[PDB]
Amino acid sequence: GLSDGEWQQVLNVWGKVEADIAGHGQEVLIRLFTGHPETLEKFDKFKHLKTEAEMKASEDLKKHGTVVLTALGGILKKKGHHEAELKPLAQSHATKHKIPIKYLEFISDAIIHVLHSKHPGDFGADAQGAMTKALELFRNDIAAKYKELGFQG
């Protein structure tokens, strides 16, 4: 669905995320977890964390922050030819972590909140359009693999 024009857009904005990955990673997860509290319970690793504060204090959260965004960057760099790297993830997210497609919706809303918050004024209408689009693409493909595996429908 995306044009090069757009992918350029997508990879420029990713350059902001890369300057401080554990930084963007931490806030993504915190925003996910606070706005959507039910999501925290899918992690036996973070479930203990009631407060936000307590969350921001967590190096383990930060370290996950970095894994999550290191994996997406990888997909994103691939400009849609990502069957190779998304196959593994759709699998583990479906059958083992048992993460509903709607929680991937949420973190996608989260990546966008976080970029405005942290980049107030240099993440324009075009880049937001492009960022939205590659995150939907990521999502539509997991969705295809969830259907297959017959997980939630």
Residue 129: CB partners within 8 Å, gap ≥ 6? 6, 9
In eight-state DSSP terms, residue 123 is S
Annotated binding-site ranges for heme b: 93
In angstroms, the Cα distances linking 84 to 30, 62, 81, 87, 93 are 29, 26, 8, 6, 15
Asked if 112 touches ligand HEM (CB under 6 A), the answer is no
Per-residue binding string, ligand HEM, 17-56, x by CB under 6 A, is: ----------------------x--xx-x-----------
Complex with ligand HEM: residue 3 or 92, whichever CB lies closer = 92
C-beta separation of 17 from 76 below 8 A: no
Complex with ligand HEM: residue 56 or 98, whichever CB lies closer = 98
Of residues 74-93, those binding ligand HEM (CB under 6 A): 89, 92-93
Asked if 151 touches ligand HEM (CB under 6 A), the answer is no
